[PDB]
Paper text:
The architecture of the archaeal 20S proteasome is conserved resembling the eukaryotic 20S, but its α and β rings are homoheptameric rather than heteroheptameric.
We did not observe a substantial α-ring rotation or a conformational change at the loop proximal to K66; however, we did observe a slight rise of Helix 0 in a direction parallel with the sevenfold axis mostly clearly seen in Fig. 5b. The T20S-αL81Y model shows that the hydroxyl group of tyrosine is within proximity to hydrogen bond with the backbone of G19, similar to ZYA’s tyrosine. Additionally, we noted that tyrosine hydrogen bonded with a water molecule that is also hydrogen bonding to the backbone of L21 but not the side chain of E25. We also noted the water which hydrogen bonds with the backbone of A30 is not displaced by L81Y, reinforcing the point that L81Y is not oriented like ZYA’s tyrosine. This structure suggests that the tyrosine interactions with G19 and L21 are sufficient to cause a Helix 0 shift upward, which consequently partially opens the gate.
Residue numbers in the entry:
A (entry chain K), I (entry chain J): 1 to 202
B (entry chain E), C (entry chain F), D (entry chain G), E (entry chain A), F (entry chain B), G (entry chain D), ...: 7 to 233
The structure:
């Protein structure tokens, strides 16, 4: 499993792979690990599939209910704070998950939350078994001045490196771009396939 | 006698407290909803009582979710409680099944909650009438709810003080499968027909939804070019 | 006096609140059920009050499961609660034993629920009469339930305002082991005989079940070619 | 006054609600039981009110187990609840001790349940009279239970509207240690003596048990050759 | 007024419901108990109302254990509940301490149970009077209990309708340390003195206990040779 | 009006049910207590109503522990409950702290229990007046308790029907630091002064305690040589 | 009749106990709030009844947090309870989400609490009217709450005895987007216009908040240079 | 009507039971408290009703802790319960935070407890008025509490029957920042001014506290040299 | 993790570093470990991130609520006493944290609280894995007579020594100064960066 989320000047880019291991061995090649949970909020999931899917449904209900009562979207920091409280409340019977939350309320944010509810903001973050390989790519190539197109290429390259070195990761790459002007936009598979050919990652 | 608490039947078999709660509904604001071609709309009358009131909290159409809206009449405090119950009930179904397939079941859960307040002593019934409209897997729907808990489906219906005047107008002029522009025009005419001789219609709130899309709340300028 | 709350006996030994709940039943819609050769059928009258009501939510025959159906009279909100209770009770038996062997026990569980609401203070009795029909291991069955909780088995029975007129007709013309076509024809004639002098019968809902098969709801066209 | 709720004593020391529940018993069907040589029998009157009722659900003798039977009078819905309580209570004793030694203790548990409904507010008493008969370790037994909870043992007893007429007949003609054929013949004569001048006896239900065997329900033909 | 529920004091300071429960005691059967030399005896009157009643269930002396017996007057259903409570309370003491040292504490537990039913709303008081007799570590004991919960110790006492007649006789003829034969003879004479002018005494039940031995119930023949 | 249940204030601010409970106290037996030199004594009047009552259960001085005694007036059944509560409360303090330092706190716990029965609906107040006397770490103490829960300390006090007569006598003749022999003599004279003109004093019960020692109950012969 | 407890509807559909609670509001102190340019202010009248009262506990503007303030009218003890509930509710939102985004939801939680006290028996409604003002993510807000639970948003509003006089003045002189100095001057004039002919205005309390900053309570000298 | 239970509003908006509880306060003993230079004092009137009462339990100033004292008027049994609640509440704050910073919060907790007894049915309000005085982090404080739960701060205040007479005197003669000797002298004069024409002041109890020190209770001799 | 708090004549100085380790390895370089919880009160957190963040939100709510009801700030000793009760109540299912609380009610105080609720006052204290290195610097250089400027230099030097020797500590140094005259003042990053150059700690 490899998930990545980065921040740009007015954009948030999130991308994951699709390989799912269940009862050992590769039993699913096209799993879903990137979810839209609000108008300008996305979440990626790593860890146990059962716990992660339950949390995704919980956040979708809470954020939609919050929107109807407050007539405004939940701020990204409030989204991470709410998740932090839920995970810490059952820390001794915990969800075995690692989560990334990203979006734009007035500025782009990416939050990393662990199983015990520890939440911390960062310009970029990666989770899963393939994350350390991604951090190597981001440490040497990430720049806050990149354009959206350049940022999409970077996350594709970083995940491609993880797929070469992490056996638990694989499959087709899913990419979502979040901006105020376009909202939550999931990039078509044909565009990403074109990008990998142009980038040289086969 | 048989008019105080609910858990008394009248000798001829009526619940007076339920009937008395219906009188409180007749003193509420007038609202209506109509079905049209591939959609359903909600119209609620908004009258102004003072220039010191912030015009925006007069929201009379409450969105239960992105695809279901409701309008209420009667006691506003009781209505707000029921609307909150509907919103939580809608999210529980989405958590359990991943989607909302039939709006009628959501309305039934609300109606069950009001029914228990007419059978168990120690409480009074809700003095609220509700109209539910939206799009589900079967298509556009339109429902009503009364203080007793009665549920009916309609092509067009109205609640409030002017319910009789609006319903009588729809009994004579309503047509099915109309365009949204035509249906809103008919709705305004129906609502106008209820205003006490002399009073002029004031900019109401209109919300409509079509199959495939989400609910859309009419802007005040778009409402203005309908009167 | 002895007419307010239930947990009072009258000096001559009647529960007035139970009797008053029976008056609410007499104001409900008229329905009937008959046994025929290897089957049982349900007929419920559907009158129209306005052209603005969606004809489909007027479902008066509720399927408890694929082999048991019910029809109710009286307060529709109280009836809906009892129907939901029956559906959950039916599924609990299927979970426990893997099947439903006797319909009478399902009816008894519903009747027990209504009986406790006539003996424990703080609640009012259900103003609902029910008819249960279906196929079980012993064969076709037909039951009734009253607000007090009385249960009887019948070859033919009726509930509602026109119960006396329908029962009197069946008291004179009913025959056993009739074909389904003949039994439905007799049922329509029995129901027609109750309409207030002048009123014309309008397309009702008919549901029948035969041994081996499941419940079948008559389509509106098939109902039409019976009047 | 002192006639509404139970937890009031009358100035002269009566519970009117308990007495009013006794009036409901006087409106029930008439039943009787007699002891004979090494056995005990139960006789209950079954009158027909319509030809549309399935004759089989008119079961007036309920088997608590294979060796204990009961017959009830008064409110049928209250009686059904008490019969179910007795059946569960009988099985609990069998689970605890592996057998049922004394029927009187089973009757006492039923009577205790009815007694608490005459002392604790918020409930009304059961309007039911019961007769228990069967074989236990000590021999044939015959018991009665009233709405208050009074228990007595009898060689012969009756309940219902015709209780006075049957008891008076047994007060004059009853003999002990009769053969089952003779005892049933005397029972039919006793029951006949209660029918309103003019009415004819109709085929009743007879159940008898002898030491060593289980309860036997008389077939309709065997009952017929007794009238 | 001040006569309905218990948790009302009368202006002059009486509990009318407790007093009304005392009236129900005055309608019960007459029973008495006397102390004699190294023992105590219980006598209860048994009248026959019909030849159809099994003479054996008329047991009016209930053994709380092998060394304590009780007799009750008033409502038999309320009395049976209190007797069962005493039996369970007696066994709890034996489990805790391995023996029963003072009968008075067992009587106090019964009296405490009846006292709470005269102070807490929602219940009515027990309409029962009780007499307790037996042998404990201190010797022969004789106690009474009333619906309020008052407890007294006596050399001789009586309860029931004929309580005044029996007590007046014992007020004049009772002597201490009599032989059991003499004490039973005096008891029968005291009880006879209460029978309505004309009525004849019928074989009663007599139970006596002496220090060292257990309770002994008189056989019907031994009772007969006392009249 | 304002006289039924407690949780009603009267317009001028009285609790009538509490006042009505005070009337029940005025019908109880007369008792008194006095302080003397390094000690405190309790005197309670014992009248005889019949020679059939065992003289020993007339114990009117109840020992809460070896150093605290109590005497009660009013309803004996309510008084017995309060005495048992005091005994358990006294042992709880000994378990917690290893000793009982102040008697006043034990009295306050009893008074708190009676106060809650005058403020919470669903119960009636205790119709009991109590006097507490004993030796604690601070010295000899003497307390009273009323149905409302009022607590006062006294050099000498009385309760019951003859409370006014005894208190008036002590208002005129009481002296402090008297010898125990003199104090008992004064107490008997005070109690005698209350007997209805004509009635003669009968042997009462006297209990006294001195600093350092435990409570001592006067034998009947020692009481006799005081009259 | 229909005026005692809440869970009764009046025949024409009013809750008299809710209306009677509104009368208690009309006897409270007069307070008002106004919106101005990028801010909102609160003004409450403080009259002096004696020179022995410490002037500082007369705080009529309670800060729910650093950015939300409230003013109350009616029963001060009921108002204090509601203010404490609002403060705890505000901190719960901050713990859950890390911030408070919409003041309206905090007001709704308070209104929901008061609504349940008008529908569930056993309690009386709060006799309190409240005004909420502060800055949230959407901007300056101004709300009112009534005993029933009705919520409205305002550019300017008043509560208390002089509510009609202040509102009428604001109906004629109020202008939007005024400077804070001008808005406070208008508020004092509006409040003065309500004083009973003859009485002179006394130094009130004024609290204002602007976007970006926290709430500021006017010092007594700064208030003085406004009269 | 509207005067029985609390959870009824009067048509004009008063709680009669709360008002009736205020009448019970007017029948209590008269007490007062005054602020002086760097301190606060408490004065309570102690009248003698008999020479048989131990003078020491007449303690009318109860120390909540070493720095907070209270005086009560009205029902002494209700007052004792509230004083115990305050003492436990004070110790809970010390356990949680290690100190007591504001006395006003302790008074508010007591007032909240009394407020809930005027809003929840099934209980009656406390008929107690309280005055709280002491030293906290902010300085000397003086508070009052009423049966409804109203709280005010004062430079000088009084409660009880003579509250009007004492307050009127303090309205005319009270001065701030007086020496303790002068303030006590003024307090005695104020209290004397309330005695019914003819009655003479009797030695009262005086308690004072200064910043830095603890509460000091005046000895009877020091009180004597003030009259 | 390295946190330090010292007391001066009329001031309290608190400073922490920013390195956060999550799922092992340095995944965040700019974490937040120094919080203002009242007008004149600050708190530093060491240990599990999830438990620490929950406690910070709890203290902010409790202290603000206490201020509104009592119209006065909670005393610093009362702040430590309240924290001690909460931690000891769940000592067998405890928060895995070590806390420092500092501020001025009328005098400067610094309190150290462990996971079991043990609270003790000290003139200076340090927590975290880098704390023993800080204690060495403070043992040989701390003086109660230093000025505020000198005290700021000392905590910067002490944390810099810990960063050289403790791999779990690192990142930019955050410093807060609490006085009655200025309240709670967080020193700007530019000033601390200037100080390290002037001090010689690179």
């Amino acid at each position: 499993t490899t998930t990545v989320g980065i921040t740009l000047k007015d954009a948030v880019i999130m991308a994951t792979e699709r390989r799912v291991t269940m009862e050992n061995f590769i039993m699913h090649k096209n799993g879903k690990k990137l979810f839209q949970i609000d108008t300008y909020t996305g979440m990626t999931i790593a860890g146990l599939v059962g716990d992660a899917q339950v949390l995704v449904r919980y956040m979708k209900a809470e954020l939609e209910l919050y929107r109807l009562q407050r007539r405004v979207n939940m701020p990204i920091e409030a989204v991470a704070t709410l998740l932090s409280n839920m995970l810490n409340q059952v820390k001794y019977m915990p969800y075995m998950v690692q989560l990334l939350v990203g979006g734009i309320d007035t500025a782009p944010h990416v939050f990393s939350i662990d199983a015990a509810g520890g939440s911390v903001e960062d310009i970029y973050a990666s989770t899963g078994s393939g994350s350390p390989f991604v951090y190597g790519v981001l440490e040497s190539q990430y720049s806050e001045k990149m354009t959206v197109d350049e940022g999409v290429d970077l996350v594709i390259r970083a995940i491609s490196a993880a797929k070469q070195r992490d056996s638990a990761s694989g499959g087709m790459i899913d990419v979502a771009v979040i901006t105020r002007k376009d909202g939550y936009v999931q990039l078509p598979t044909d565009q990403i396939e074109s990008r990998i050919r142009k980038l040289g990652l086969i | 006698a048989y008019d105080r608490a609910i858990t008394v039947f009248s000798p001829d078999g009526r619940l007076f407290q339920v009937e008395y709660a219906r009188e409180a509904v007749k003193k509420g604001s007038t609202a209506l909803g109509m079905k049209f071609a591939n959609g359903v709309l909600l119209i609620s009358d908004k009258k102004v009582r003072s220039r010191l009131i912030e015009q925006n909290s007069i929201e009379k159409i409450q969105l239960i979710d992105d695809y279901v809206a409701a309008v209420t009449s009667g006691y506003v405090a009781d209505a707000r409680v029921l609307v909150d119950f509907a919103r939580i009930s809608a999210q529980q179904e989405k958590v359990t099944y991943g989607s909302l397939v039939n709006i009628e079941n959501l309305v039934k859960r609300v109606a069950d909650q009001m029914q228990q307040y007419t059978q168990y002593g120690g409480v009074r019934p809700y003095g609220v009438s509700l109209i539910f409209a939206g799009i589900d897997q079967i298509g556009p729907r339109l429902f009503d709810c009364d203080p007793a808990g009665t549920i009916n489906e309609y092509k067009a219906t109205a609640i409030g003080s002017g319910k009789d005047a609006v319903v009588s107008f729809l009994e004579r002029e309503y047509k099915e499968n109309l365009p949204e522009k035509e249906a809103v025009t008919l709705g305004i005419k129906a609502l106008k027909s209820s205003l006490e001789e002399g009073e002029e219609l004031k900019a109401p709130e209109i919300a409509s939804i079509t199959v495939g899309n989400k609910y859309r709340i009419y802007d005040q300028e778009e409402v203005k070019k309908f009167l």
